Coordinates of C-alpha atoms and ligand atoms in Angstrom, one line a residue:
Chain L
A1 CA 6.6 11.9 -37.3
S2 CA 10.6 11.8 -37.2
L3 CA 10.9 8.8 -34.7
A4 CA 13.5 6.9 -33.1
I5 CA 13.5 3.2 -34.2
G6 CA 11.8 0.7 -31.5
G7 CA 9.7 2.2 -28.9
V8 CA 6.3 1.9 -27.6
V9 CA 3.4 3.8 -29.0
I10 CA 1.0 5.1 -26.7
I11 CA -2.8 5.9 -27.5
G12 CA -4.0 8.6 -25.0
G13 CA -2.0 11.7 -24.0
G14 CA -3.7 12.5 -20.6
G15 CA -2.9 12.0 -16.9
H16 CA -3.3 8.2 -17.0
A17 CA -0.7 8.4 -20.0
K18 CA 1.6 10.4 -17.8
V19 CA 1.8 7.4 -15.3
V20 CA 2.1 4.8 -17.9
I21 CA 5.0 6.5 -19.4
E22 CA 7.0 6.7 -16.2
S23 CA 6.0 3.0 -15.5
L24 CA 7.6 2.1 -19.0
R25 CA 10.6 4.2 -18.4
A26 CA 11.1 2.9 -14.9
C27 CA 11.5 -0.6 -16.8
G28 CA 13.9 0.7 -19.2
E29 CA 11.5 1.1 -22.2
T30 CA 11.5 4.2 -24.6
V31 CA 8.0 5.6 -25.5
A32 CA 8.2 6.4 -29.2
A33 CA 5.3 8.7 -29.7
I34 CA 1.4 9.4 -28.6
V35 CA -1.5 9.6 -30.5
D36 CA -4.5 11.6 -29.1
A37 CA -7.9 12.6 -30.3
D38 CA -6.7 16.2 -29.9
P39 CA -3.8 15.9 -32.3
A40 CA 4.0 16.6 -26.0
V41 CA 3.4 14.4 -22.8
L42 CA 6.2 14.1 -20.2
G43 CA 8.5 14.8 -23.4
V44 CA 6.7 12.1 -25.6
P45 CA 5.6 13.8 -28.8
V46 CA 2.1 13.9 -29.8
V47 CA 2.2 13.0 -33.8
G48 CA -1.3 12.9 -34.6
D49 CA -4.9 11.2 -33.8
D50 CA -5.7 7.6 -34.2
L51 CA -5.5 8.0 -38.2
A52 CA -1.7 8.2 -37.5
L53 CA -1.6 4.5 -36.3
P54 CA -1.0 3.0 -40.0
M55 CA 1.9 5.5 -40.4
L56 CA 3.3 4.4 -37.5
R57 CA 3.2 0.9 -38.0
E58 CA 4.6 1.2 -41.6
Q59 CA 7.7 2.8 -40.1
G60 CA 8.4 -0.2 -38.0
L61 CA 6.9 0.6 -34.8
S62 CA 4.8 -2.5 -33.6
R63 CA 4.5 -2.2 -29.9
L64 CA 1.7 -0.2 -28.4
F65 CA -0.1 0.7 -24.8
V66 CA -3.5 2.2 -24.6
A67 CA -3.5 4.7 -22.0
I68 CA -7.1 5.6 -21.7
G69 CA -8.8 5.3 -18.4
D70 CA -12.6 4.8 -19.8
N71 CA -12.9 1.1 -20.0
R72 CA -15.4 0.7 -22.8
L73 CA -13.1 3.0 -25.1
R74 CA -9.9 1.6 -24.0
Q75 CA -11.1 -1.6 -24.8
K76 CA -12.3 -0.5 -28.5
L77 CA -8.7 1.1 -28.8
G78 CA -6.9 -1.8 -27.8
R79 CA -8.9 -3.9 -30.6
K80 CA -8.1 -1.3 -33.2
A81 CA -4.5 -1.0 -32.3
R82 CA -4.4 -4.9 -32.7
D83 CA -6.0 -4.7 -36.0
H84 CA -3.1 -2.1 -37.3
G85 CA -0.7 -4.7 -36.5
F86 CA 0.4 -3.6 -33.0
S87 CA 1.1 -6.1 -30.1
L88 CA 0.0 -4.6 -26.7
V89 CA 2.6 -4.3 -24.2
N90 CA 2.2 -4.4 -20.3
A91 CA 3.1 -1.4 -18.2
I92 CA 4.3 -2.7 -14.9
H93 CA 6.0 -0.6 -12.5
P94 CA 9.2 -2.1 -11.3
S95 CA 7.8 -1.7 -7.8
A96 CA 4.8 -3.7 -8.0
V97 CA 4.9 -7.1 -6.7
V98 CA 3.5 -9.8 -9.2
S99 CA 3.5 -13.4 -8.0
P100 CA 4.9 -15.9 -9.9
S101 CA 1.8 -17.7 -10.6
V102 CA -0.2 -14.8 -11.8
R103 CA -1.5 -15.0 -15.2
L104 CA -1.4 -11.7 -17.3
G105 CA -3.0 -10.8 -20.3
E106 CA -1.7 -7.8 -22.7
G107 CA -2.3 -4.3 -22.5
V108 CA -2.2 -4.3 -18.7
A109 CA -1.3 -1.4 -16.5
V110 CA 0.0 -2.3 -13.0
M111 CA 1.1 0.6 -11.0
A112 CA 3.9 1.4 -8.4
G113 CA 3.1 -0.1 -5.1
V114 CA 0.7 -2.7 -6.2
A115 CA 0.6 -6.6 -4.9
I116 CA -1.0 -9.3 -6.9
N117 CA -1.0 -12.6 -5.1
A118 CA -1.0 -16.3 -5.8
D119 CA -3.0 -17.9 -9.1
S120 CA -4.6 -14.6 -9.9
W121 CA -5.6 -14.1 -13.4
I122 CA -5.5 -10.4 -14.9
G123 CA -7.4 -10.1 -18.3
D124 CA -6.2 -8.0 -21.3
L125 CA -6.4 -4.1 -21.0
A126 CA -7.0 -4.4 -17.2
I127 CA -5.9 -1.5 -14.9
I128 CA -4.4 -2.2 -11.6
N129 CA -4.1 1.2 -10.3
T130 CA -1.6 2.5 -7.7
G131 CA -1.3 0.7 -4.5
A132 CA -3.9 -1.7 -5.2
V133 CA -4.0 -5.2 -3.6
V134 CA -5.4 -8.2 -5.6
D135 CA -5.2 -11.3 -3.4
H136 CA -4.8 -14.8 -4.0
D137 CA -6.9 -16.4 -6.6
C138 CA -9.0 -13.4 -8.1
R139 CA -10.2 -13.3 -11.7
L140 CA -10.3 -9.8 -13.1
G141 CA -12.0 -9.4 -16.6
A142 CA -10.6 -7.8 -19.6
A143 CA -10.7 -4.0 -19.5
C144 CA -11.5 -3.7 -15.9
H145 CA -10.0 -1.1 -13.4
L146 CA -9.0 -1.4 -9.8
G147 CA -8.6 2.2 -8.7
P148 CA -5.9 3.5 -6.5
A149 CA -5.6 1.9 -3.2
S150 CA -8.4 -0.6 -3.8
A151 CA -8.2 -4.2 -2.3
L152 CA -9.7 -7.5 -3.2
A153 CA -9.5 -10.2 -0.3
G154 CA -9.0 -13.2 -2.4
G155 CA -11.1 -15.3 -4.7
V156 CA -12.9 -12.3 -6.2
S157 CA -14.0 -12.0 -9.6
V158 CA -14.6 -8.8 -11.5
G159 CA -16.2 -8.7 -14.6
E160 CA -15.3 -6.9 -18.0
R161 CA -15.1 -3.3 -17.9
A162 CA -16.0 -3.1 -14.0
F163 CA -14.6 -0.1 -12.3
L164 CA -13.6 0.1 -8.5
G165 CA -13.1 3.5 -7.5
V166 CA -10.3 4.8 -5.0
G167 CA -10.0 2.9 -2.0
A168 CA -12.8 0.3 -2.9
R169 CA -12.6 -3.2 -0.9
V170 CA -14.2 -6.5 -1.7
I171 CA -14.4 -9.3 0.8
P172 CA -13.4 -12.8 -0.1
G173 CA -15.3 -14.7 -2.7
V174 CA -17.5 -11.9 -4.2
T175 CA -18.2 -11.6 -7.7
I176 CA -18.6 -8.2 -9.6
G177 CA -20.4 -8.3 -12.8
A178 CA -19.4 -6.5 -16.1
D179 CA -19.6 -2.9 -16.4
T180 CA -20.5 -2.1 -12.7
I181 CA -19.1 0.5 -10.8
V182 CA -18.0 0.5 -7.0
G183 CA -17.8 4.2 -5.6
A184 CA -14.6 5.1 -4.0
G185 CA -14.4 3.7 -0.4
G186 CA -17.3 1.0 -1.3
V187 CA -17.1 -1.9 0.6
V188 CA -18.7 -4.8 -1.4
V189 CA -20.0 -7.7 1.1
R190 CA -22.2 -9.6 -1.7
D191 CA -22.2 -10.4 -5.2
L192 CA -23.0 -7.4 -7.4
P193 CA -24.8 -7.8 -10.8
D194 CA -23.9 -6.3 -14.2
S195 CA -24.5 -2.9 -15.0
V196 CA -25.0 -1.2 -11.5
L197 CA -23.6 1.4 -9.2
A198 CA -22.9 0.4 -5.7
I199 CA -21.5 2.9 -2.8
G200 CA -21.2 2.9 0.9
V201 CA -20.1 0.8 3.6
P202 CA -21.4 -1.6 3.0
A203 CA -21.9 -1.0 -0.5
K204 CA -25.3 -0.8 -1.8
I205 CA -26.8 -0.4 -5.2
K206 CA -27.9 3.2 -6.3
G207 CA -30.8 3.2 -8.4
Chain V
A1 CA 7.1 -38.8 1.7
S2 CA 10.4 -39.0 -0.5
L3 CA 11.3 -35.3 0.3
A4 CA 14.6 -33.5 -0.2
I5 CA 16.8 -32.6 2.8
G6 CA 15.9 -29.3 4.7
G7 CA 13.1 -27.3 3.7
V8 CA 10.1 -25.9 5.3
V9 CA 7.1 -28.0 6.3
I10 CA 3.8 -26.2 5.9
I11 CA 0.6 -27.1 7.8
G12 CA -2.3 -26.2 5.3
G13 CA -2.8 -26.5 1.8
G14 CA -5.5 -23.8 1.1
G15 CA -5.2 -20.3 -0.4
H16 CA -3.4 -18.9 2.5
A17 CA -0.7 -21.7 2.0
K18 CA -0.4 -20.7 -1.8
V19 CA 0.6 -17.0 -0.7
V20 CA 3.0 -18.5 2.2
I21 CA 4.8 -20.7 -0.2
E22 CA 5.3 -17.8 -2.6
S23 CA 6.7 -15.4 0.2
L24 CA 9.2 -18.4 1.4
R25 CA 10.2 -19.1 -2.4
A26 CA 10.8 -15.4 -2.9
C27 CA 13.3 -15.3 0.2
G28 CA 15.1 -18.5 -1.3
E29 CA 13.7 -20.9 1.1
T30 CA 12.5 -24.3 -0.1
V31 CA 9.0 -25.8 0.9
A32 CA 9.5 -29.3 1.6
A33 CA 6.0 -30.6 2.0
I34 CA 2.4 -29.9 3.3
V35 CA 0.2 -31.5 5.5
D36 CA -3.4 -31.0 5.1
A37 CA -6.6 -32.5 6.8
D38 CA -7.8 -33.4 3.4
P39 CA -4.5 -35.8 3.0
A40 CA 0.0 -30.8 -4.4
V41 CA 0.1 -26.8 -3.8
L42 CA 1.9 -24.8 -6.0
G43 CA 4.1 -28.0 -6.7
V44 CA 4.6 -28.7 -3.1
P45 CA 3.4 -32.2 -2.4
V46 CA 0.6 -32.8 0.5
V47 CA 2.2 -35.9 2.2
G48 CA -0.6 -36.5 4.6
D49 CA -2.6 -34.9 7.5
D50 CA -1.3 -33.9 10.8
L51 CA -0.5 -37.6 11.9
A52 CA 2.4 -37.3 9.2
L53 CA 4.1 -34.5 11.5
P54 CA 6.2 -37.2 13.6
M55 CA 7.5 -39.1 10.3
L56 CA 8.6 -35.6 8.9
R57 CA 10.5 -34.8 12.1
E58 CA 11.9 -38.1 12.2
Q59 CA 13.3 -37.7 8.6
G60 CA 15.0 -34.6 9.6
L61 CA 12.7 -32.0 8.7
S62 CA 12.7 -29.4 11.4
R63 CA 11.3 -25.9 10.2
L64 CA 7.6 -25.3 9.9
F65 CA 5.0 -22.8 8.9
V66 CA 1.4 -23.0 9.8
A67 CA -0.7 -21.7 6.8
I68 CA -4.2 -21.5 8.2
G69 CA -6.1 -18.4 8.0
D70 CA -8.3 -19.5 11.3
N71 CA -7.0 -17.8 13.9
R72 CA -7.6 -20.2 16.9
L73 CA -7.0 -23.3 15.0
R74 CA -3.6 -21.6 13.7
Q75 CA -2.5 -21.1 17.1
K76 CA -3.6 -24.7 18.2
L77 CA -1.6 -26.1 15.5
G78 CA 1.5 -24.0 16.2
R79 CA 1.6 -25.5 19.5
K80 CA 1.2 -29.0 18.1
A81 CA 3.9 -28.3 15.8
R82 CA 6.4 -27.1 18.5
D83 CA 5.6 -30.0 20.6
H84 CA 6.4 -32.3 17.5
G85 CA 9.9 -30.6 17.8
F86 CA 9.6 -28.2 14.7
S87 CA 10.7 -24.7 14.8
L88 CA 8.4 -22.1 13.6
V89 CA 9.6 -19.9 10.8
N90 CA 8.5 -16.6 9.5
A91 CA 7.4 -16.0 6.1
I92 CA 8.1 -12.5 5.4
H93 CA 8.0 -11.5 1.6
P94 CA 10.9 -9.6 0.5
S95 CA 9.1 -6.4 -0.7
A96 CA 7.8 -6.0 3.1
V97 CA 9.5 -3.3 4.9
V98 CA 10.1 -4.2 8.4
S99 CA 11.8 -1.6 10.6
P100 CA 14.9 -2.6 12.3
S101 CA 13.4 -1.6 15.7
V102 CA 10.4 -4.2 15.2
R103 CA 10.4 -7.3 17.5
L104 CA 9.1 -10.3 15.6
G105 CA 7.8 -13.3 17.1
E106 CA 7.8 -16.8 15.3
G107 CA 5.3 -18.2 12.9
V108 CA 4.7 -14.9 11.6
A109 CA 3.3 -14.2 8.2
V110 CA 4.3 -10.9 6.6
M111 CA 2.7 -10.6 2.9
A112 CA 3.9 -8.3 0.1
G113 CA 3.6 -4.7 0.0
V114 CA 3.4 -4.5 4.1
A115 CA 5.1 -1.5 6.2
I116 CA 5.8 -2.0 9.8
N117 CA 7.2 0.8 11.6
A118 CA 9.5 1.7 14.8
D119 CA 9.0 -0.2 17.8
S120 CA 6.1 -2.4 16.9
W121 CA 5.8 -5.7 18.4
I122 CA 4.4 -8.7 16.5
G123 CA 3.6 -11.7 18.4
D124 CA 3.8 -15.4 17.4
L125 CA 1.6 -16.8 14.6
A126 CA 0.2 -13.2 13.8
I127 CA -0.8 -12.6 10.2
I128 CA 0.0 -9.1 8.6
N129 CA -1.4 -9.4 5.2
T130 CA -1.0 -8.1 1.7
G131 CA -0.4 -4.1 1.9
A132 CA -1.3 -3.7 5.4
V133 CA 0.4 -1.1 7.4
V134 CA 1.5 -1.0 11.1
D135 CA 2.9 2.3 12.1
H136 CA 5.0 2.9 15.1
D137 CA 4.5 1.7 18.5
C138 CA 2.0 -1.1 17.8
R139 CA 1.5 -4.2 19.7
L140 CA 0.0 -7.1 17.9
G141 CA -0.8 -10.2 20.1
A142 CA -0.4 -13.8 19.2
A143 CA -2.4 -15.2 16.4
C144 CA -4.0 -11.8 15.4
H145 CA -4.7 -11.4 11.6
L146 CA -4.5 -7.9 9.9
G147 CA -6.1 -8.4 6.8
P148 CA -5.2 -7.2 3.2
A149 CA -4.8 -3.4 3.1
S150 CA -5.7 -2.9 6.8
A151 CA -4.1 -0.1 8.6
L152 CA -3.1 0.8 12.2
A153 CA -2.0 4.4 13.0
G154 CA 0.5 4.0 15.7
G155 CA 0.0 3.2 19.4
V156 CA -2.5 0.5 18.7
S157 CA -2.7 -2.8 20.6
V158 CA -4.5 -5.8 18.9
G159 CA -5.5 -8.7 21.3
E160 CA -4.8 -12.3 20.7
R161 CA -6.6 -13.9 17.8
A162 CA -8.3 -10.6 16.8
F163 CA -9.1 -10.2 13.3
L164 CA -9.3 -7.0 11.0
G165 CA -11.1 -7.4 7.9
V166 CA -9.7 -6.0 4.4
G167 CA -9.2 -2.2 4.5
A168 CA -10.1 -2.0 8.3
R169 CA -8.4 1.1 9.9
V170 CA -7.6 1.8 13.5
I171 CA -6.8 5.3 14.8
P172 CA -3.9 6.0 17.1
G173 CA -3.7 4.8 20.7
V174 CA -6.7 2.3 20.2
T175 CA -6.8 -1.0 22.2
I176 CA -8.9 -4.0 20.7
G177 CA -9.6 -7.2 22.7
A178 CA -8.7 -10.5 22.1
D179 CA -10.8 -12.7 19.9
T180 CA -12.5 -9.4 18.1
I181 CA -13.6 -9.2 14.6
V182 CA -13.6 -5.8 12.8
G183 CA -15.5 -6.0 9.6
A184 CA -14.1 -5.3 6.2
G185 CA -13.5 -1.4 6.0
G186 CA -14.5 -0.8 9.5
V187 CA -12.9 2.4 11.1
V188 CA -12.3 1.7 14.8
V189 CA -12.3 5.3 16.8
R190 CA -12.7 3.8 20.2
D191 CA -11.4 0.8 22.2
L192 CA -13.1 -2.5 21.7
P193 CA -13.7 -5.2 24.3
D194 CA -12.8 -8.9 23.7
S195 CA -15.0 -11.1 21.7
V196 CA -17.1 -8.7 19.6
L197 CA -17.8 -7.9 16.2
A198 CA -17.5 -4.2 15.1
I199 CA -18.5 -2.7 11.6
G200 CA -18.9 0.5 9.9
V201 CA -17.5 3.9 9.6
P202 CA -17.2 4.5 12.4
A203 CA -16.9 1.0 13.6
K204 CA -19.9 0.0 15.9
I205 CA -20.4 -3.2 17.9
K206 CA -23.0 -5.6 16.4
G207 CA -25.1 -7.8 18.7
Chain Z
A1 CA 26.4 17.9 23.5
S2 CA 29.7 16.0 22.3
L3 CA 28.6 15.1 18.8
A4 CA 29.9 13.5 15.8
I5 CA 30.6 15.8 12.6
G6 CA 27.9 16.0 10.1
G7 CA 24.6 14.4 10.9
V8 CA 21.0 15.6 11.0
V9 CA 19.5 17.6 13.7
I10 CA 16.2 16.4 14.6
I11 CA 13.4 19.0 16.2
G12 CA 11.0 16.4 18.2
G13 CA 11.5 13.3 20.0
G14 CA 8.4 11.5 19.8
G15 CA 6.6 8.7 18.0
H16 CA 7.0 10.6 14.8
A17 CA 10.6 11.2 15.4
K18 CA 11.3 7.5 15.6
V19 CA 9.8 6.9 12.1
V20 CA 11.7 9.7 10.5
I21 CA 15.0 8.6 12.3
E22 CA 14.6 5.0 10.7
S23 CA 13.9 6.4 7.4
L24 CA 16.8 8.6 7.4
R25 CA 19.1 5.6 8.5
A26 CA 17.8 3.8 5.9
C27 CA 19.2 6.0 3.3
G28 CA 22.5 5.8 5.0
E29 CA 22.4 9.3 6.6
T30 CA 23.4 9.8 10.3
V31 CA 21.1 11.3 12.9
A32 CA 23.4 13.7 14.9
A33 CA 21.0 15.1 17.8
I34 CA 17.4 15.6 19.1
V35 CA 16.0 18.8 20.5
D36 CA 12.8 18.3 22.4
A37 CA 10.5 20.5 24.6
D38 CA 11.1 18.0 27.5
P39 CA 14.9 18.6 27.5
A40 CA 17.4 9.1 24.0
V41 CA 15.2 8.2 20.9
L42 CA 16.3 5.2 19.0
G43 CA 19.6 5.9 20.3
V44 CA 20.0 9.5 19.2
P45 CA 20.7 11.8 21.9
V46 CA 18.1 14.7 23.3
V47 CA 20.8 17.4 23.9
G48 CA 18.3 20.1 25.0
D49 CA 15.2 22.0 24.1
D50 CA 15.1 24.5 21.0
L51 CA 17.3 27.0 23.0
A52 CA 20.1 24.4 21.9
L53 CA 19.6 25.4 18.4
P54 CA 22.3 28.1 18.1
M55 CA 24.9 26.0 19.9
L56 CA 24.1 23.0 17.3
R57 CA 24.7 25.5 14.4
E58 CA 27.7 26.9 15.9
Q59 CA 29.4 23.7 16.2
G60 CA 29.0 23.0 12.5
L61 CA 25.7 21.2 12.1
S62 CA 23.9 22.5 9.6
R63 CA 21.0 20.0 8.3
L64 CA 17.8 19.5 10.2
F65 CA 14.4 17.8 10.0
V66 CA 11.2 18.8 11.9
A67 CA 9.7 15.6 13.4
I68 CA 6.6 17.1 14.9
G69 CA 3.2 15.8 13.6
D70 CA 1.3 18.8 14.6
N71 CA 1.1 20.8 11.1
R72 CA 1.1 24.3 12.4
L73 CA 3.8 23.7 15.1
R74 CA 6.0 21.9 12.7
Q75 CA 5.7 24.8 10.1
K76 CA 6.5 27.3 13.0
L77 CA 9.6 25.1 13.8
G78 CA 10.8 24.8 10.5
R79 CA 10.9 28.7 10.1
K80 CA 12.7 28.7 13.2
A81 CA 15.3 26.1 12.1
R82 CA 15.9 28.0 8.8
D83 CA 16.4 31.3 10.7
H84 CA 19.0 29.7 12.7
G85 CA 20.8 28.9 9.7
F86 CA 19.7 25.0 9.2
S87 CA 18.6 23.5 6.0
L88 CA 15.8 21.3 6.0
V89 CA 16.4 18.1 4.5
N90 CA 13.8 15.4 3.3
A91 CA 13.3 12.2 5.1
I92 CA 12.3 9.7 2.2
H93 CA 12.0 6.1 3.2
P94 CA 14.0 4.0 0.4
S95 CA 11.0 2.1 -0.4
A96 CA 8.8 4.9 -1.3
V97 CA 8.1 5.5 -5.1
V98 CA 8.5 9.0 -6.0
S99 CA 8.0 9.7 -9.8
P100 CA 10.8 11.4 -11.7
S101 CA 8.3 14.4 -12.4
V102 CA 7.5 15.0 -8.8
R103 CA 8.6 18.3 -7.1
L104 CA 9.5 18.0 -3.9
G105 CA 9.8 20.9 -1.2
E106 CA 12.2 20.8 1.8
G107 CA 11.7 19.1 5.2
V108 CA 9.2 16.7 3.7
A109 CA 8.7 13.4 5.1
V110 CA 8.0 10.4 3.0
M111 CA 7.3 7.1 4.7
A112 CA 7.6 3.6 3.8
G113 CA 5.2 2.0 1.2
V114 CA 4.4 5.5 -0.3
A115 CA 3.6 5.9 -3.9
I116 CA 3.7 9.7 -5.4
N117 CA 2.9 9.7 -9.3
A118 CA 3.5 12.1 -12.2
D119 CA 3.7 15.8 -11.8
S120 CA 2.6 16.0 -8.4
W121 CA 3.9 18.9 -6.1
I122 CA 4.4 18.4 -2.6
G123 CA 5.1 21.5 -0.5
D124 CA 7.7 22.0 2.2
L125 CA 7.2 20.3 5.4
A126 CA 4.5 18.0 4.0
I127 CA 4.0 14.5 5.5
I128 CA 3.2 11.5 3.0
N129 CA 2.9 8.9 5.7
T130 CA 3.2 5.1 5.6
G131 CA 1.5 3.4 2.7
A132 CA -0.2 6.5 1.3
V133 CA -0.7 7.1 -2.4
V134 CA -0.6 10.2 -4.3
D135 CA -1.6 9.9 -7.8
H136 CA -0.9 12.0 -10.7
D137 CA -1.3 15.7 -10.9
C138 CA -1.6 16.3 -7.1
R139 CA -0.8 19.6 -5.4
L140 CA 0.1 19.2 -1.7
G141 CA 0.4 22.5 0.3
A142 CA 3.1 23.4 2.7
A143 CA 2.9 21.5 6.0
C144 CA 0.0 19.4 5.1
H145 CA -0.1 15.6 6.3
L146 CA -1.6 12.7 4.4
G147 CA -2.0 10.2 6.9
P148 CA -1.0 6.3 6.8
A149 CA -2.9 4.3 4.0
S150 CA -4.4 7.5 2.5
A151 CA -5.2 8.0 -0.9
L152 CA -5.6 10.7 -3.4
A153 CA -7.0 9.9 -6.7
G154 CA -5.3 12.3 -9.1
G155 CA -5.6 16.2 -9.6
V156 CA -6.5 16.5 -5.9
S157 CA -5.0 19.9 -4.2
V158 CA -4.6 19.7 -0.5
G159 CA -4.3 23.3 1.3
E160 CA -1.7 24.3 3.8
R161 CA -1.7 22.4 7.2
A162 CA -4.8 20.0 6.1
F163 CA -4.7 16.6 7.7
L164 CA -6.1 13.4 6.3
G165 CA -6.4 10.8 8.7
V166 CA -5.5 7.1 8.5
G167 CA -7.1 5.6 5.3
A168 CA -8.8 8.9 4.1
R169 CA -9.6 8.9 0.4
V170 CA -10.2 11.7 -2.1
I171 CA -11.6 11.4 -5.6
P172 CA -10.2 13.0 -8.7
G173 CA -10.2 16.8 -9.1
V174 CA -11.2 17.7 -5.5
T175 CA -9.8 20.7 -3.7
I176 CA -9.6 20.6 0.2
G177 CA -9.0 23.8 1.8
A178 CA -6.2 24.8 4.4
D179 CA -6.3 23.8 8.0
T180 CA -9.2 21.2 7.4
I181 CA -9.2 17.8 8.8
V182 CA -10.7 14.6 7.2
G183 CA -11.3 12.0 9.6
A184 CA -10.0 8.4 9.5
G185 CA -11.6 6.8 6.6
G186 CA -13.3 9.8 5.3
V187 CA -14.3 9.4 1.4
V188 CA -14.2 13.2 0.1
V189 CA -16.1 13.5 -2.9
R190 CA -16.8 17.1 -3.1
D191 CA -14.4 20.2 -2.6
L192 CA -14.0 21.2 1.2
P193 CA -13.3 24.8 2.4
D194 CA -10.7 25.7 4.7
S195 CA -10.7 25.2 8.5
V196 CA -13.7 22.5 8.6
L197 CA -13.7 18.8 9.7
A198 CA -15.2 16.3 7.6
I199 CA -16.1 12.5 8.5
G200 CA -17.8 9.5 6.9
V201 CA -18.3 7.8 3.9
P202 CA -19.1 10.0 2.0
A203 CA -17.3 12.5 4.1
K204 CA -19.6 15.4 5.6
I205 CA -18.5 18.6 7.5
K206 CA -19.2 18.3 11.0
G207 CA -20.3 21.4 12.8
Ligands
CL301 CL1 10.9 7.7 -23.7
CL302 CL1 -4.6 -1.1 -19.3
CL303 CL1 -27.9 -3.3 -2.6
CL304 CL1 9.8 -25.1 -2.8
CL305 CL1 1.1 -16.6 10.9
CL306 CL1 -20.2 0.5 19.8
CL307 CL1 22.3 7.8 13.5
CL308 CL1 7.5 17.0 7.4
CL309 CL1 -21.0 18.4 4.1

């Protein structure tokens, strides 16, 4: 707990955190400390578990990112961080292309190589992972995850906490419900309800 | 119809136009006006339908882009624009990587995150959509469309007006005929004739 | 054989060489000469076959790249180049995003539009082709090839000389053996042994 003045606190110290740390540093931000349920990651000290959050706030740190891949858990930890007085920053790699008409929430991760086009809306705590494409007029719910190299072809709505695996694709105009999982490589050609798993080309719900 | 001096006229005012407008603006270009069959889009005024083109030309506007996703219609409107005295500009996002040995036509859209490698030839009115990859020695016919996140692995020939859906892939050396559609996620491993639909991994013609 | 002082010698004069030449030139490097088994490529002279390597070294050229797509052959030619006193450079397009914690070998090609994330290790003579994504904590063996638009979702190990075709995907944590081929579009969801061919969504070994 001896820390510099002013950087970003990270919740989570795993592989996702490594990537987030590098996005932040590529933008010139400083990462102050990690809190992890196992109480360094790329040189950032792990100072305790989530019980350390009040102490971090008290010492003047007020900016935070939740680097937890699990969508439901990330969402819960973002709420906890905000209750403790932290503001949720975004971690947007400088190579990502984010159109000027995109609406971004808070606590959003946007990895290297991403493109997000016109009039897309990105909810709080979303992850738009490495190389993913979000075409025009998409709506991404809070705490969803578009996995690496996934692609949404415009007018796609993705529900809260939905997860698209590596290389998933969605054709124009499709809606995917909250809490749904699209497997790696799945090609979604019809609306998906909430709380299902869909896999394949074309993607099919698996009971 | 009171317009500034010198910008680009856009045919079409839909979702594709939004993305094109943003590509042009990212390059420092000004978008003058839209003509749309329904007679603003991201702040660009819609001044009429295609019957307004002569009036736009008369007032000194001479640069145009056809922002219409339908390949056959785009091609026809490009001809009409040229007959009315417009030059067809390209709309190439600054993040796109276009090799110095690529040959580009006119009226070409190249979206964010694209890469086009050595000695590829891109016909007039092609769309190389968001995140698409065109490897070395490809030949893209006039008014074709490589959809978002699609990839051509080198030495691929794509016929006039062909359309590759989101995330389609083509292995080296394959030829795809004019007017053919490859569904989203289709993986093309053999030449395709003209005027067919192919879907799947590997892609198969669907009667 | 009259050559400038100081550039890079390229082994191979085919389509892959074209792309490599352009990567090098985009970084401000000069390409001195090609040696090719058939004894110009984008303006670089072909000066002989591999028997010309001693003469090139004698005249002061000492930097080399092996632009041969075949993995086993590339590996053998890299050894031969090093025995002749050449150092193997990397050919990394300036648009590629290579995290600061990535470990790179020598003789590595990294094409336009690539992203490689935290704590990934890239073996000598690997090819990370156009638009490919290598997420955190990956291990790429010597002389492997990640084809255009392929994606590894983190914690993936790729054996020596393995080849992933255009648009292949690998889910987190998977190991792929040496000398294995994943077909274009294959989605690898389980470890693959050495010396197999796997195709499909999900990828399945083909006898
Ligand atoms: Cl830091
Ligand atoms: Cl996030
Ligand atoms: Cl289904
Ligand atoms: Cl404008
Ligand atoms: Cl176009
Ligand atoms: Cl067929
Ligand atoms: Cl040169
Ligand atoms: Cl290489
Ligand atoms: Cl199998």
